[PDB]
């Protein structure tokens, strides 16, 4: 119908109007479309081959002519020229693609199925023509200019961010996908970023202090994320973040370590938190921080304890409070800066155990059992009256902290024994700061200890309660008594009972015989205290004394001087006890005669003068505590041996034949909640068991034991 030559002259003019963007007539569009339609309608044998070559030539010429204009432009010049030319070209290309839609519907679709790879849609043809003609000569200049603009923006200036976005969009769309963007822009971007940040980091660390570099680095990383969000493709996020993290932190970790040590020496919570946030982003880079923290906590604990010296050995409060302060400061540091990380709490726990179970005090006492003993003594000091009623809120916190410290002690049996003894002594003499404290401590011990120890403590409480009820009931039937069971109290039991209390003794014996049958009462006199009324003194004196002191002050009424050889027979007391109590009497400034001999003369200091009527001559004996410590330690050792032997028998009675390492491991994990045994003790127990015909060694296969009935 219509030949190609008839329309090409008008078609060229029409297409020229599409470019050089102006108002586009609402009818010229269809006027141009109709020529294409009439040309395209005149084995398939399609028609639209010739128009494609002419369109390609036209776009070729247009791109070359427009490239001649801006071959020698500068940074802002190339950016602008490229941006407006790209926008105009994209718009005009889309319009032209719309004009010639018939070709796209039939001819290119036919040629694509055949296998010809040189045929594209007209829009894709325009894009590929742009890429082949204009992109190649100007890519280096545009990229370098964009990089210079970005570098200027990095030094604190302000740039036209819309210029870079157009270039990035043009690069992304020209991948006919991200092929061009990665190999034309990202490579140079990430190559220049490394150099810039390297020189910036070196210069910053050369002059400024290391603490501010962390803030600088975090600001830099946040700025990089914002930049990628605002005028770059989203795919660059991970690569840019990784490269920046590398170049900013991984090279400087070596000095970061020393900075961490210095900021550990002087407390700086926020800075440590910032360092934790920074070094966290490096994979497997937090280990050195954990090791340094553990070593620092250990050394700080040892240094703090060693400072006190000889005083801390006999002062439970100072010894406990040093440890508590060292634990508390670093625990708060771990909660705040490091956000409850498992590794850091593990390091703190290990360090705390290390300096709690071995320090300067333990070397002074030549044993590792002094720490639980001092902790028990501190609890006893807290729970006594001590010249001031404690506040309930403050006492509970101290008890909770003590329970926290108790967790890191390996030898818990010593603490249990000493606490039991001290609680018994407190309950018998009735001097407790508050009952709520005893209840809370019993509850905590229930939670964090065994069931036999708790049973014994509860039985002690029950006995004291029933004794109080019995005393209240018996008061009306008529001085106080404390009736206790036999095996539930630790006290281990020669006294001329004065006639002043003989009637009460007989009355109470008759009462107990009447109420209960078959039960014999054993009387402990060294733990009984009361009051006295006296006549032959300056005036009415009231004094507090032990029952032995009661007898030895009531033994003399009208006589003054006595010879202790006869006094021993009079009072029925052994040598050492009588000598110690006489030394106590002399130390009380209430008697007149330190070496005691059976012929020594001791008199009474008549007209004794005292500052206050309320006098308590029942002072605690100094040597009694030192004598008791060795006895209770020996008892603890014997109990340890018995438990080890029982555990070995129990473990061998289930596994008939076992080696050495498995046996030791099983014993250690079975006894891990009470104490940590020593290998020589286990070996000695095994050797004893073999001797006593309980288990034998199999012939051959040495270092192996077998159960024998």
């Amino acid at each position: 119908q219509i030949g190609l030559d008839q329309i090409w002259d008008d078609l060229r003019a029409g297409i020229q109007q599409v470019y050089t963007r102006q108002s586009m007539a609402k009818s010229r569009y269809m006027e141009l479309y109709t020529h294409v339609y009439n040309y395209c309608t005149s084995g398939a044998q399609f028609v639209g081959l010739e128009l494609y070559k002419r369109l390609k030539e036209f776009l070729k010429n247009y791109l070359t002519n427009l490239l001649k204009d801006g071959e020698d432009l500068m940074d802002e010049s190339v950016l602008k020229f490229y941006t407006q030319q790209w926008e105009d070209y994209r718009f005009s290309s889309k319009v032209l693609n719309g004009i010639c839609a018939y070709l796209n519907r039939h001819w290119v679709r036919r040629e694509c199925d055949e296998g010809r790879k040189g045929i594209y849609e007209i829009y894709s043809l325009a894009l590929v023509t742009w890429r082949d003609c204009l992109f190649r000569p100007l890519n280096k200049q545009v990229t370098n200019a964009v990089l210079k603009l970005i570098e200027k923006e990095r030094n604190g200036e302000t740039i036209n961010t819309r210029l870079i976005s157009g270039v990035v969009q043009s690069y992304v769309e020209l991948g006919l996908t991200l092929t061009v963007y990665k190999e034309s822009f990202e490579s140079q971007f990430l190559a220049d970023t490394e150099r810039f940040y390297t020189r910036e980091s070196t210069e910053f660390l050369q002059q400024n202090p290391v603490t501010e570099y962390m803030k600088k680095a975090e600001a830099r990383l946040l700025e990089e994320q914002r930049r990628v969000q605002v005028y770059l493709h989203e795919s660059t996020q991970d690569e840019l973040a990784r490269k920046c993290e590398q170049v900013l932190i991984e090279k400087h970790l070596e000095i970061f370590h020393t900075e961490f040590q210095n900021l550990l020496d002087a407390d700086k919570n926020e800075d440590l938190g910032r360092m934790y946030n920074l070094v966290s982003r490096i994979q497997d880079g937090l280990g050195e921080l954990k090791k340094l923290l553990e070593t620092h906590i250990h050394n700080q604990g040892l240094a703090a304890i060693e400072k006190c010296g000889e005083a801390a050995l006999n002062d439970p409060k100072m010894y406990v409070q040093t440890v508590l302060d060292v634990h508390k400061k670093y625990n708060a540091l771990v909660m705040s800066a490091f956000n409850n990380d498992a590794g850091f709490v593990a390091a703190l726990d290990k360090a705390c155990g290390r300096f709690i179970n071995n320090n300067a005090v333990t070397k002074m006492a030549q044993s590792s059992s002094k720490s639980p003993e001092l902790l028990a003594r501190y609890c006893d000091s807290l729970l006594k009256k001590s010249s001031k009623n404690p506040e309930e809120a403050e006492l509970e916190d101290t008890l909770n902290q003590v329970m926290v410290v108790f967790k890191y002690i390996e030898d818990k049996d010593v603490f249990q024994k000493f606490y039991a003894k001290m609680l018994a002594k407190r309950l018998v003499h009735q001097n407790s700061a508050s009952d709520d404290a005893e209840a809370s401590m019993i509850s905590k011990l229930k939670q964090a200890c065994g069931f036999e120890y708790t049973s014994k403590l509860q039985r002690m409480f029950q006995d004291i309660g029933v004794s109080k009820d019995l005393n209240e009931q018996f008061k009306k039937h008529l001085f106080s008594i404390q009736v206790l069971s036999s095996g539930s109290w630790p006290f281990q039991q020669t006294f001329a009972l004065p006639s002043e209390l003989e009637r009460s003794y007989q009355r109470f014996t008759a009462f107990y015989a009447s109420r209960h049958s078959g039960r014999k009462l054993t009387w402990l006199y060294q733990l009984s205290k009361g009051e006295l009324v006296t006549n032959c003194f300056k005036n009415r004196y009231t004094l507090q004394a032990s029952t032995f002191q009661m007898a030895i002050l009531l033994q003399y009424n009208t006589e003054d001087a006595y010879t202790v050889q006869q006094l021993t027979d009079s009072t029925q007391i052994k040598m050492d006890i009588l000598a110690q109590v006489l030394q106590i009497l002399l130390k009380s400034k209430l008697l007149v005669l330190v070496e005691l001999k059976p012929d020594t003369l001791i008199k009474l200091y008549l007209g004794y003068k005292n500052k206050k009527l309320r006098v308590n001559i029942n002072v605690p004996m100094k040597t009694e505590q030192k004598q008791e410590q060795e006895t209770t330690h020996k008892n603890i050792e014997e109990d340890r041996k018995l438990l080890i032997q029982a555990a070995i028998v129990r473990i061998m009675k289930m596994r008939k034949v076992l080696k050495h390492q498995q046996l030791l491991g099983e014993v250690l994990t079975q006894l891990s909640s009470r104490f940590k045994p020593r290998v020589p003790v286990i070996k000695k127990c095994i050797d004893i068991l073999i001797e006593k015909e309980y288990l034998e060694r199999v012939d051959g296969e040495k270092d192996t034991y077998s159960y024998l009935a």
């Binding site: 009735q430 001085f479 106080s480 008594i481 404390q482 209390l501 402990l524 009984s528």
Partner: peptide
């Protein structure tokens, strides 16, 4: 005056 003694009961 007043006295506080302690004793244990056993079989």
């Amino acid at each position: 005056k007043k006295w506080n003694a302690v004793a244990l009961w056993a079989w």
